[PDB]
C-alpha cells in the first residue's frame, strides 16, 4: 500500500531529455549455468540474443558469467548507482528477451509509488496564484473603514 | 598405452570425390557410381571401414542405416562437424567489445 511504501516524485537523473537522451543503465551482470534446468533460458538468450543486445545497446557491458548456479540471475546496474537483481530462472528466451529489454529501458530510478504523474520545474509563467491577485487596489492604499 | 583421445573435428577433404571414388573402384567402376546401392553388408563394410580409417571420422549407428548409397555417404563426409566448447565458440563468434564472457569451470 501507499501508506506502508515509500514514495518519491516523478523525476530524470541528470534530466536525462534537455541536452541528449542518456541510458541509464550501464551494466548487465549475466550469472549462467552450463548444466541445469533453470538455465536453459538464459544459456539460449547467451547464444542467440545477448550479442544483438550488446551490439543493440553499445553503452552498456554486459558480463556473461557461466558458473554452477540454481537460480541464474541478471543484475542491473545503472548510472545513478542503483541496482536491480532479477531472477532469470526458469524463463524462456522471450522472456529474458522482453526482461533485458525493460531493463534497458528503464531508469536506475527506485520503482515505489510516484506521487504526481508529472514534474515540473516552472509551474507558474504568469505568476503562482496569492490571496491578492484579482484583488483590486484602493486609493492610497486606504483598508477598509480607515478614516484618512 | 591408451591412445590420445581423438578430435571430433572433420573438415572435409578438398579431393573428397576422388579419394571415394578410388575406394569404391577398390571395393566394388560402372557409371554413376554414386548411385551404387550399399545393400552388401560385405561391400557396406568395407567402403565404410576404409573411409572411416583414412579420414578419422566414421559413420554413427544412427546414420549406418540411412547411407544407403554411395551419394549418401558422399553427403556425410562433405558435411563438416566441429568439437570446440561452447566457451570457445562464443568467444570466437566476434563478439561486440562491450560484451564479456567468463567461465568459471
Redesign the interface.
Known amino acids: 500500500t501507499a501508506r506502508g511504501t515509500p514514495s518519491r516524485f516523478l523525476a530524470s537523473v541528470l534530466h536525462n531529455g534537455l541536452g541528449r537522451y542518456v541510458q541509464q543503465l550501464q551494466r548487465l551482470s549475466f550469472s549462467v549455468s552450463r548444466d541445469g534446468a533453470s538455465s536453459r533460458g538464459a544459456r539460449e538468450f547467451v547464444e542467440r540474443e545477448v550479442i544483438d543486445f550488446a551490439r543493440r545497446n553499445p553503452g552498456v557491458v554486459i558480463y556473461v558469467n557461466s558458473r554452477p548456479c540454481c537460480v541464474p540471475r541478471v543484475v542491473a546496474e545503472y548510472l545513478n548507482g542503483a541496482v536491480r537483481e532479477e531472477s532469470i530462472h526458469c524463463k524462456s528466451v522471450e522472456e529474458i528477451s522482453t526482461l533485458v529489454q525493460k531493463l534497458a529501458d528503464q531508469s536506475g530510478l527506485d520503482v515505489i509509488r510516484i506521487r504526481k504523474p508529472f514534474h515540473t520545474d516552472n509551474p507558474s509563467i504568469q505568476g503562482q496564484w496569492h490571496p491578492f491577485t484579482n484583488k483590486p487596489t484602493t486609493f492610497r492604499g486606504l483598508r477598509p473603514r480607515e478614516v484618512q | 598405452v591408451c591412445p590420445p583421445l581423438r578430435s571430433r573435428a572433420y573438415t572435409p577433404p578438398e579431393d573428397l570425390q576422388s579419394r571415394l571414388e578410388s575406394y569404391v573402384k577398390e571395393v566394388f567402376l560402372p557409371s554413376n557410381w554414386q548411385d551404387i546401392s550399399l545393400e552388401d553388408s560385405r561391400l557396406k563394410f568395407n567402403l565404410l571401414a576404409h573411409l572411416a580409417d583414412d579420414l578419422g571420422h566414421v559413420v554413427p549407428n544412427s546414420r549406418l542405416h540411412q547411407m544407403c548409397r554411395v551419394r549418401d555417404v558422399l553427403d556425410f563426409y562433405n558435411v563438416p562437424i566441429q568439437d570446440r566448447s561452447?566457451?570457445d565458440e562464443?568467444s570466437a563468434?566476434?563478439?561486440?567489445?562491450?560484451?564479456?564472457?567468463?567461465?568459471?569451470?
Open positions: 561452447k566457451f562464443l563468434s566476434n563478439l561486440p567489445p562491450n560484451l564479456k564472457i567468463t567461465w568459471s569451470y
